[PDB]
Short mmCIF file of C-alpha atoms and ligand atoms in Angstrom, two decimals:
data_model
loop_
_atom_site.label_atom_id
_atom_site.label_comp_id
_atom_site.label_asym_id
_atom_site.label_seq_id
_atom_site.Cartn_x
_atom_site.Cartn_y
_atom_site.Cartn_z
CA UNK V 7 78.38 111.79 116.44
CA UNK V 8 81.89 110.53 117.14
CA UNK V 9 82.80 111.63 120.68
CA UNK V 10 85.71 114.15 121.08
CA UNK V 11 87.27 111.46 123.37
CA UNK V 12 86.99 108.73 120.65
CA UNK V 13 88.11 111.32 118.16
CA UNK V 14 91.23 111.84 120.38
CA UNK V 15 91.89 108.15 120.43
CA UNK V 16 91.67 107.92 116.67
CA UNK V 17 93.89 110.90 116.01
CA UNK V 18 96.56 110.48 118.71
CA UNK V 19 96.76 107.11 120.28
CA UNK V 20 98.93 104.33 118.85
CA UNK V 21 99.63 101.86 121.62
CA UNK V 22 100.11 98.92 119.11
CA UNK V 23 103.85 99.91 118.77
CA UNK V 24 106.25 101.42 121.30
CA UNK V 25 107.98 103.59 118.60
CA UNK V 26 107.59 104.76 115.02
CA UNK V 27 110.09 102.23 113.70
CA UNK V 28 109.57 103.43 110.02
CA UNK V 29 109.61 106.45 107.74
CA UNK V 30 106.51 104.91 106.02
CA UNK V 31 104.76 105.38 109.39
CA UNK V 32 103.24 108.85 109.08
CA UNK V 33 102.23 108.34 105.42
CA UNK V 34 100.36 105.20 106.38
CA UNK V 35 99.14 106.40 109.73
CA UNK V 36 97.80 109.83 108.67
CA UNK V 37 95.79 108.07 105.92
CA UNK V 38 94.69 105.14 108.08
CA UNK V 39 93.27 107.53 110.73
CA UNK V 40 91.32 109.59 108.22
CA UNK V 41 93.50 112.64 108.71
CA UNK V 42 93.60 113.13 104.89
CA UNK V 43 89.88 112.97 104.02
CA UNK V 44 89.04 116.70 103.89
CA UNK V 45 92.60 117.87 103.20
CA UNK V 46 96.16 117.12 104.19
CA UNK V 47 96.31 117.75 107.94
CA UNK V 48 99.49 119.86 108.16
CA UNK V 49 100.75 118.45 111.60
CA UNK V 50 99.74 115.45 113.77
CA UNK V 51 101.27 113.72 116.81
CA UNK V 52 100.92 110.06 117.72
CA UNK V 53 101.62 108.81 121.27
CA UNK V 54 103.14 105.36 121.72
CA UNK V 55 101.71 104.59 125.21
CA UNK V 56 98.95 102.76 126.96
CA UNK V 57 95.56 104.35 126.83
CA UNK V 58 95.38 104.38 130.68
CA UNK V 59 98.87 106.09 130.83
CA UNK V 60 97.71 108.85 128.45
CA UNK V 61 94.28 109.17 130.22
CA UNK V 62 96.11 109.33 133.63
CA UNK V 63 97.77 112.60 132.35
CA UNK V 64 94.40 114.33 132.95
CA UNK V 65 95.21 114.28 136.65
CA UNK V 66 98.90 115.19 136.34
CA UNK V 67 100.52 118.69 136.02
CA UNK V 68 97.91 121.33 135.37
CA UNK V 69 99.25 123.85 132.84
CA UNK V 70 97.86 126.65 130.64
CA UNK V 71 96.59 125.56 127.25
CA UNK V 72 97.87 127.36 124.12
CA UNK V 73 94.35 129.01 123.77
CA UNK V 74 94.39 130.36 127.30
CA UNK V 75 92.22 127.66 128.89
CA UNK V 76 93.01 126.02 132.21
CA UNK V 77 92.06 122.38 131.28
CA UNK V 78 95.52 121.30 129.92
CA UNK V 79 97.84 118.89 131.77
CA UNK V 80 101.52 117.93 131.27
CA UNK V 81 102.86 114.36 131.60
CA UNK V 82 105.18 113.85 134.57
CA UNK V 83 107.50 111.55 132.68
CA UNK V 84 108.29 111.57 129.03
CA UNK V 85 106.45 109.56 126.53
CA UNK V 86 107.19 107.96 123.07
CA UNK V 87 105.65 110.25 120.45
CA UNK V 88 105.95 110.60 116.73
CA UNK V 89 105.54 114.01 115.15
CA UNK V 90 104.13 113.86 111.58
CA UNK V 91 104.86 117.05 109.64
CA UNK V 92 103.60 117.66 106.02
CA UNK V 93 106.45 118.10 103.40
CA UNK V 94 106.85 120.80 100.60
CA UNK V 95 105.95 118.36 97.77
CA UNK V 96 102.86 117.19 99.74
CA UNK V 97 99.86 117.98 97.44
CA UNK V 98 96.40 116.76 98.35
CA UNK V 99 95.29 114.05 97.77
CA UNK V 100 98.89 112.71 97.66
CA UNK V 101 99.56 113.78 101.30
CA UNK V 102 103.17 112.95 102.24
CA UNK V 103 104.78 113.16 105.74
CA UNK V 104 108.24 113.58 107.28
CA UNK V 105 108.12 111.08 110.23
CA UNK V 106 110.05 112.26 113.33
CA UNK V 107 110.52 110.30 116.60
CA UNK V 108 111.29 111.66 120.13
CA UNK V 109 110.75 111.16 123.88
CA UNK V 110 109.14 114.23 125.19
CA UNK V 111 106.61 115.14 127.82
CA UNK V 112 103.13 115.50 126.33
CA UNK V 113 100.53 118.13 127.05
CA UNK V 114 96.87 117.38 126.51
CA UNK V 115 93.50 119.09 127.22
CA UNK V 116 90.92 117.07 129.15
CA UNK V 117 87.20 117.45 129.71
CA UNK V 118 84.13 115.33 130.57
CA UNK V 119 82.88 112.74 132.98
CA UNK V 120 84.94 110.64 133.10
CA UNK V 121 87.65 113.31 132.74
CA UNK V 122 89.67 112.27 129.64
CA UNK V 123 91.81 113.79 126.83
CA UNK V 124 90.09 115.45 123.91
CA UNK V 125 93.09 117.30 122.44
CA UNK V 126 96.87 117.28 122.05
CA UNK V 127 98.32 120.67 122.75
CA UNK V 128 102.11 120.16 122.70
CA UNK V 129 105.19 118.09 123.40
CA UNK V 130 107.94 119.44 125.61
PD1 PD E 230 111.35 116.26 132.24
#
């Protein structure tokens, strides 16, 4: 019983660095975070910000989730994220990732008490 909230931390938080300073980054990180145990996860996003900052988004701009739910919120300022996308030559269990860096607003879905993120919906 890993909590969705802990699951969110494992899958999307990386405060430890302020930017994906490497092209290794995704390869390492996707494997490190167990996003390659069942299969190659096609796409994952990592957020280079404090946990409190990312949790604070849960009381920022309420916006429609991609699945039609009302429990998504958009960051007021941009955040340092790193998109990991799976390449063509990625074959499980040799999962390989094109690292990509940007500053975009994030959008997350929150739920629970305390009200915290359990899902990364999009960057904008
Ligand atoms: Pd903006």
